[PDB]
Amino acid sequence: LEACAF
Amino acid sequence: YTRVVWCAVGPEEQKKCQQWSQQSGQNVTCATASTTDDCIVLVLKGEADALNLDGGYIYTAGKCGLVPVLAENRKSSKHSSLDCVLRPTEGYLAVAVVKKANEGLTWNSLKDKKSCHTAVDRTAGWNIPMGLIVNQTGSCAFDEFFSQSCAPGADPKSRLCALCAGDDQGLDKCVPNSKEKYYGYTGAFRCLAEDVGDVAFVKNDTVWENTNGESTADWAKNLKREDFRLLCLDGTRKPVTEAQSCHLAVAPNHAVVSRSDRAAHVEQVLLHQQALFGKNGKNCPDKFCLFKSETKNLLFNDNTECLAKLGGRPTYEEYLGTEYVTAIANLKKCS
Ligand SMILES: *[C@@H]1O[C@H](CO)[C@@H](O[C@@H]2O[C@H](CO)[C@@H](O)[C@H](O)[C@H]2NC(C)=O)[C@H](O)[C@H]1NC(C)=O
Ligand SMILES: *[C@@H]1O[C@H](CO)[C@@H](O[C@@H]2O[C@H](CO)[C@@H](O)[C@H](O)[C@H]2NC(C)=O)[C@H](O)[C@H]1NC(C)=O
Ligand SMILES: *[C@@H]1O[C@H](CO)[C@@H](O[C@@H]2O[C@H](CO)[C@@H](O)[C@H](O)[C@H]2NC(C)=O)[C@H](O)[C@H]1NC(C)=O
Ligand SMILES: Cc1ccc(-c2cc(C(F)(F)F)nn2-c2ccc(S(N)(=O)=O)cc2)cc1
Ligand SMILES: [Fe+3]
Ligand SMILES: [Zn+2]
Ligand SMILES: [Zn+2]
User: Fold this and answer.
1) In the CATH hierarchy, which top-level class contains the domain B74-254+317-327?
2) Separation of alpha carbons A4 and B175, rounded Å
3) Do domains B2-73+255-316 and B74-254+317-327 have the same CATH topology?
4) B249 phi, psi to nearest 5 deg
5) Domain ranges in chain B?
């Protein structure tokens, strides 16, 4: 759902 | 006009991209990384502009702010006056394929069998079947469902990589790029063909394109379509001619993504590059074919007729569609 993975 | 820097995943794509770069007179140049996730980081850093992505990876890229630019469009099934670039895309069918001789394997008996996946995080290879399996089993322990697998991008020492074979030298086992023998649609179908695995999660077109003489490649040249069956979610097995009634999902076509700030330039350059190098482009087959790579699906799928314009300037969620996005979201809750 949330933030960018990087 | 500026140059567009394409990101190639691994060395075989790098070599194709260098040929493209040469033929385009450096209108396109090349950056290369070992995995699709690393190419996505190169684009986020602005060290590359674009690459073409499976829907599962469009989800990753789009959570990071990159946007869809043009989509792969293969031969339509149903008639159209419309030019390929303007035709709406029809997703592809995600299927689970087994050998006809492995009688009595069905969807309902996949537990503890050997599986072949295109790569972790891809649509037909991973998100759709593992999403369905997590849901149906009520457990997030999808790394313990199959006894062994090849799922490029998983931990190389885990059972999800036990069946991966690595490159010519047996190096790079389980890396998610074409150097891994069993990577991608063609690699996962080869993993089944060679009976390394009992089931392959690929798309319908893969089975057709690598059977009955459609591939001359050494592992494929002798495969017969009648020796394969599809697994239906109702527990039945059908012939591979029945994929419209025996698939796991319809997937959104692979598409080019880029930084938002470069999408317009990337789109223009690509529309001009396929005029030259795409299906009957001015210079294909004489100088370079952007959508061929002897079945290896390098940069683009070999079955791509053109890259098509998107309707509605979609965001990545609109492009993937709300159902698939929530399916991915739900599955990512497991890790
Ligand atoms: C490389 O890109 C340049 C820049 O767009 C191309 O040069 C243009 O060619 C068009 C015809 O398509 C001419 O009308 C213009 O004079 C040129 N445009 C500009 C902005 O100078 C060139 O054709 C490209 N070549 C390849 C091989 O990709
Ligand atoms: C599954 O994939 C195959 C391969 O793409 C599809 O077969 C192609 O269908 C088009 C027209 O619909 C033909 O022009 C091609 O010649 C076919 N290719 C081959 C190799 O036979 C097939 O239609 C797809 N099945 C479903 C249900 O989508
Ligand atoms: C796995 O199950 C989850 C939970 O039901 C599914 O997520 C639901 O999908 C429907 C249809 O898109 C939505 O209306 C619900 O809101 C979703 N529920 C939740 C909790 O988000 C998901 O689609 C299933 N995965 C697969 C691959 O079918
Ligand atoms: C013939 C065909 C083609 C695509 C799809 C499809 C499926 C999905 C999903 F949610 F199931 F993944 N999305 N999705 C889709 C949705 C919206 C666009 S958009 N915004 O570019 O118009 C592009 C693709 C379905 C059938
Ligand atoms: Fe895919
Ligand atoms: Zn369906
Ligand atoms: Zn919109």
Assistant:
1) alpha beta
2) 22
3) yes
4) -170, 165
5) 2-73+255-316, 74-254+317-327
User: Which residue is it, tokens 């990384």?
Assistant: B33
User: In which order are the strands placed within the sheet that holds B50-53?
Assistant: B28-33, B4-9, B50-53, B255-259, B66-74, B304-309
Distance of CA B259 to CAs B74, B77, B139, Å?
25, 32, 36
Q: Contact at 8 Å (CB) between B107 and B229?
A: no
Alpha-carbon gap: B46 to the closest alpha carbon of chain A (Å): 14
- Parallel, antiparallel or unpaired: strands B114-117 and B199-203: parallel
B122 assigned binding-site residue: yes
Measured distance CA(B299)–CA(B50) in Å, rounded? 11
* Contact check, Cβ <8 Å, A5/B329: no
For ligand 3, mutation pick of B59, B128, B326 (most atoms within 8 Å of CB): B326
Angstrom distance (rounded) from CA B293 to CA B118: 18
**DSSP character at residue B65:** T
- Experimentally, the structure was elucidated by X-ray
Q: Under DSSP, is residue B216 helix (H, G, I), strand (E, B) or coil?
A: coil
Residue type, B279: K
Taking the alpha carbons of B11, B13, B15, B21 in that order, is the dihedral positive or negative? negative
- The helix/strand/coil state of B303 is coil
Work out the end-to-end distance of chain A between its first and last CA atoms, rounded to an integer number of angstroms: 14
Q: How far apart are the first and last CA of chain B?
A: 42
* Atom 9 (ligand 1) nearest CA: B272
Data resolution in angstroms: 1.8
CATH no. of B2-73+255-316: 3.40.190.10
| Burial class, B157, CB count within 10 angstroms (exposed 0-12 / middle 13-18 / buried 19+) | exposed
The token pair that represents B144 in the structure block:
């313990």
Q: CB atoms < 10 A from the CB of B312, how many?
A: 7
Residue type, B15: K
Residue position matching structure tokens 């009688």: B103
